[PDB]
Design a protein around this ligand. Sequence first.
Ligand SMILES: NC(=O)c1ccc[n+]([C@@H]2O[C@H](COP(=O)([O-])OP(=O)(O)OC[C@H]3O[C@@H](n4cnc5c(N)ncnc54)[C@H](O)[C@@H]3O)[C@@H](O)[C@H]2O)c1
Ligand SMILES: NC(=O)c1ccc[n+]([C@@H]2O[C@H](COP(=O)([O-])OP(=O)(O)OC[C@H]3O[C@@H](n4cnc5c(N)ncnc54)[C@H](O)[C@@H]3O)[C@@H](O)[C@H]2O)c1
Ligand SMILES: NC(=O)c1ccc[n+]([C@@H]2O[C@H](COP(=O)([O-])OP(=O)(O)OC[C@H]3O[C@@H](n4cnc5c(N)ncnc54)[C@H](O)[C@@H]3O)[C@@H](O)[C@H]2O)c1
Ligand SMILES: NC(=O)c1ccc[n+]([C@@H]2O[C@H](COP(=O)([O-])OP(=O)(O)OC[C@H]3O[C@@H](n4cnc5c(N)ncnc54)[C@H](O)[C@@H]3O)[C@@H](O)[C@H]2O)c1
Lengths: 272, 277, 278, 278
Amino acid sequence: AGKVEGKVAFITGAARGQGRSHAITLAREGADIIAIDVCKQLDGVKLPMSTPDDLAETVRQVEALGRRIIASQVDVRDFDAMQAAVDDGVTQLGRLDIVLANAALASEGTRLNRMDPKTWRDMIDVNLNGAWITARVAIPHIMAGKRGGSIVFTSSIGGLRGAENIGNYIASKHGLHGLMRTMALELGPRNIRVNIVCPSSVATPMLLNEPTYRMFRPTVEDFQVASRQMHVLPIPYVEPADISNAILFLVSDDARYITGVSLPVDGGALLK
Amino acid sequence: AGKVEGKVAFITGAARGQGRSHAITLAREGADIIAIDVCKQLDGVKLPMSTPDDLAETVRQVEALGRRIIASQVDVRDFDAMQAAVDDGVTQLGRLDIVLANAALASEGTRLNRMDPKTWRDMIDVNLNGAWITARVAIPHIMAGKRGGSIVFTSSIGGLRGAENIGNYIASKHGLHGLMRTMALELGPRNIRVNIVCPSSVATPMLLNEPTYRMFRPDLENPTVEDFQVASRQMHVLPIPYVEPADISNAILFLVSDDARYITGVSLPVDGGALLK
Amino acid sequence: MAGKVEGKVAFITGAARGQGRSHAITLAREGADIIAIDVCKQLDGVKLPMSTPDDLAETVRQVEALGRRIIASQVDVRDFDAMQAAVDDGVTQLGRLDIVLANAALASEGTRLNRMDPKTWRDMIDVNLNGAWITARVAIPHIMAGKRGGSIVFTSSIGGLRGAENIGNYIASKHGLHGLMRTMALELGPRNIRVNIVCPSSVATPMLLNEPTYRMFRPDLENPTVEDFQVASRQMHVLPIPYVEPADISNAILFLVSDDARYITGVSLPVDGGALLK
Amino acid sequence: MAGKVEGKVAFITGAARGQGRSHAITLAREGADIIAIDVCKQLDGVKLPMSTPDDLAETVRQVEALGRRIIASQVDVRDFDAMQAAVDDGVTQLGRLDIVLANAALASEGTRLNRMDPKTWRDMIDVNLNGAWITARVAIPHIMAGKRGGSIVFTSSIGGLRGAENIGNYIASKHGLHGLMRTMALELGPRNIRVNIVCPSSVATPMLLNEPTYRMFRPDLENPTVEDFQVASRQMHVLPIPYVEPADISNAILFLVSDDARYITGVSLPVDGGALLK
Ligand SMILES: NC(=O)c1ccc[n+]([C@@H]2O[C@H](COP(=O)([O-])OP(=O)(O)OC[C@H]3O[C@@H](n4cnc5c(N)ncnc54)[C@H](O)[C@@H]3O)[C@@H](O)[C@H]2O)c1
Ligand SMILES: NC(=O)c1ccc[n+]([C@@H]2O[C@H](COP(=O)([O-])OP(=O)(O)OC[C@H]3O[C@@H](n4cnc5c(N)ncnc54)[C@H](O)[C@@H]3O)[C@@H](O)[C@H]2O)c1
Ligand SMILES: NC(=O)c1ccc[n+]([C@@H]2O[C@H](COP(=O)([O-])OP(=O)(O)OC[C@H]3O[C@@H](n4cnc5c(N)ncnc54)[C@H](O)[C@@H]3O)[C@@H](O)[C@H]2O)c1
Ligand SMILES: NC(=O)c1ccc[n+]([C@@H]2O[C@H](COP(=O)([O-])OP(=O)(O)OC[C@H]3O[C@@H](n4cnc5c(N)ncnc54)[C@H](O)[C@@H]3O)[C@@H](O)[C@H]2O)c1
């Protein structure tokens, strides 16, 4: 009997990286999956974004574990598309227990006094408004099940402290802590727990790119020596599995009374 | 000589309430003022918003103190119009030292699992994106003055904790804390300090209205301001139902004065202890 | 099949009953041997019944029923020399030390800070904060000597993160733990020793479930019962529960000391039914 | 004008020099009379020279030059009876008590928490945390008796909000203040007594400007100068400064105890040049 046996989880940004890792982790532990990813290169985004074939690979991996998955290409900003995806997913699978609001854009990096309004607005829209949309379309289905459930937003240590050059990302992530606290207060009586995980740096294509290395100074090793200095434990970053394992704890029975919390998985970065 | 003698402050939502109080407090203490307010009833807001006459009253009170004020009707969401208003104010007045990001919408009250996406997004746009716009159009003029400056965002005890029914307002206010910390880090080396004040409840039209009394007293049919004050006093630790606009202006005056020259990146509650419980 | 702390040794203070017992049995179920201490006597001026030697003997029985070794002794966490002796003799017997759970504490007598005697203040700080430091201090040399890293968890409280009337000595001591935890996490992190805090709200143990506590929670009633207490306590939480179980705290600790939490350090993890949200 | 604290009386610990002296003169300039104490002795295990009786007389000279009254004496904040006698005697002589600034403290010598001996840990907690409680405890009855409310300000540190290696006893002690402050704010708020904390980063006093502190800031350097320290200290601030002046802390405190801050309580106000941001 897996830790989430028979449950259904809705996961955004499931085509690669942490989102994929959560999908396979929860599936391995007995959950069926409603997965979305935008699967397209958004205007103004520099590095390669997930493709449909990436999402199809998440699908093949979940199915290999013996679980069902309903996947679609949806932008978290498109309220009607998000509503249709979760609605169709619950129709297929019969329930909804867990929501992992994980989809996000990383900052291109501009001082806030230099940034133009579209660059600020789009980041807030994906990372904050899209996170609210994700929970908003899913909650009615969790409530209909009458068994409680779990919502986890992925924030960042930049949800708890500032950083130069990425202020739009930083503000979007701070906003998630407000969303998390209200929703935890509103849904507590329904036994739906709402928490945040705050990674420092995670080995995914969001981090492991030439533009990021430059922002830390350059090879990956050049980057790793500077990344290590940000951590207290002797690591450059954590693995997607570390975030998935924290999330697995939070959605399990063992964490039944934990709500309203922001859990850093950051090798001690917040300490300094 | 006053605490902000010879300086210039840009203040949003200056038509009434805390914005007007800030204008007159800083004007009393020697500053000239660039004042904006939307002065229009925005689609989806039920309570009466400030009028053009309201902004003209702020002007009259500032001019009565012998200070100069350049006022205009500008939505904080409107990047080009905000750019123009601050550019023109700096042209007329000569410099910019202080930015008070004060304009905001109150939440009408709707559970996050029932809220419409426009209701959610408009609130973020005014309260968070508009606050960013406010700072962004002003910073270049503060930078060019080469004397440093101060930027103060008005958050809320709702920027530091959640509350039922007003989660779009909560999220928007929490977002300011990250905008403030980033901007404090980026501008600190040029002696521009960036801080937040977090009021609990403030005696302005945003608080003192029947829909608010109902939200505080959902147990009663037609709650009065007195019924509201009972509930409100219970939220505070000091024996008060709310603070005055002047209490916020006084905290702001301290933060922008030489007495707070090395204070940056802080969130200062003015909340009668409400955050303690 | 290996449990989550298979082959490890945990030093647990306040192990005679309540949360400390629960941690001892949870970690033993998951493959750890235990060094367990508790003062096992009614301390001067403490008005709630403290653990007895029989209580500690019961923790021992339950740990040994799980097929694990336990070295248990009656030690006051304030007594540096005896704490040092206990841990040293325990490591001599078991061969290593991996995990430290600084759990022992006294609950507050409930006096306003402006009426409190200096002895009442000092003793609370000495047990809950200084004794917590002593606990880590005597253990860390053994963890380092093992060259495998390790885990230290202090038990704080939601009262380590916010204040409460009437219990301010306890509140101060618990706040102090967050500073202890942070420095220690910084100092020991390069050696792969993770250091964290758990912050329970209210936990179903004799520290909570006593008439003086029910009276403190219901100043509106003349003689409150446990049920009157549960009513108010449920209103203080966001999930509608009056308290968590010792097992909920043990399960959070088990996560934190396990490989699944290998890169978590410097955190305070509330296990609080959302109490901190309001 | 009347000053911002006209006619009020402030009890200030650690008044012989540095910040405590700056508070006393600043409040005096703004109309307050002063009850000042300082231990005025070299305490055992403290390496750098501490305040002397002559330092305290110099604070007295400055307050009296501003035309105010000051009752000054040599008291250790850890000494409950002596602390009670000082404040009782000061109130007898000056007529009332409105403001308490718990400012006295020891700076950590610098030892890893896994190597520190128990006296080194305990003495630091006893001065910085217990002594701060004693300070508020002996003063509160006089403030309450005035029925006019008042203000209590504890001086913490950015080390009350985050950890640092080598100074763990200091860090724990300052974190404990935030607990003391919160409970006291909750207990005294219905009486209109506000209770707050100020958190300086580094302040230009003998506690900061000394060769052992220089060495702590530049452990990379053989015999670091004050300039070498200022380079590293500036790196840790966000504003282009190496420290704040005692007057910066006094000015924040003046704000907090003035009518302009009448509704601010329970808050921790960093005066830190943005050090906490990174
Ligand atoms: N990678 C890091 O170091 C790091 C650190 C802290 C927090 N985070 C956060 O972790 C979460 C996961 O990111 P990751 O590391 O897996 O990065 P990633 O880029 O590998 O994965 C993010 C996924 O989200 C998808 N996505 C982006 N915008 C979307 C939209 N509008 N609609 C739908 N899908 C969209 C992308 O296509 C991508 O597949 C994000 O919240 C991110 O901010 C990442
Ligand atoms: N009143 C309270 O109890 C309370 C509590 C916590 C925080 N706050 C915050 O205090 C600040 C001041 O509010 P107040 O109490 O003076 O309320 P108010 O309604 O009296 O003043 C706000 C002003 O902002 C203006 N405004 C609103 N939207 C605008 C836009 N898009 N562009 C330009 N101007 C706009 C309004 O016309 C109004 O004049 C706000 O940030 C509010 O969120 C208020
Ligand atoms: N019960 C609650 O509601 C609650 C809530 C928040 C935090 N806590 C904390 O949880 C932890 C465990 O408490 P509990 O709920 O198991 O209470 P408990 O009283 O049942 O257990 C505490 C144990 O600590 C022991 N102890 C006390 N002083 C000691 C000393 N000087 N030396 C050695 N042993 C000593 C007692 O004998 C007792 O066995 C403590 O840190 C407590 O402060 C408890
Ligand atoms: N100086 C800094 O850089 C710095 C930084 C952060 C916080 N702080 C805090 O600021 C406060 C003031 O320190 P300062 O910088 O003025 O240092 P200082 O050493 O110049 O002043 C401290 C004064 O307190 C007195 N004192 C010490 N122990 C005492 C005791 N047991 N009883 C009575 N008096 C005693 C000393 O004799 C001295 O006169 C302290 O709380 C300190 O911990 C200082």
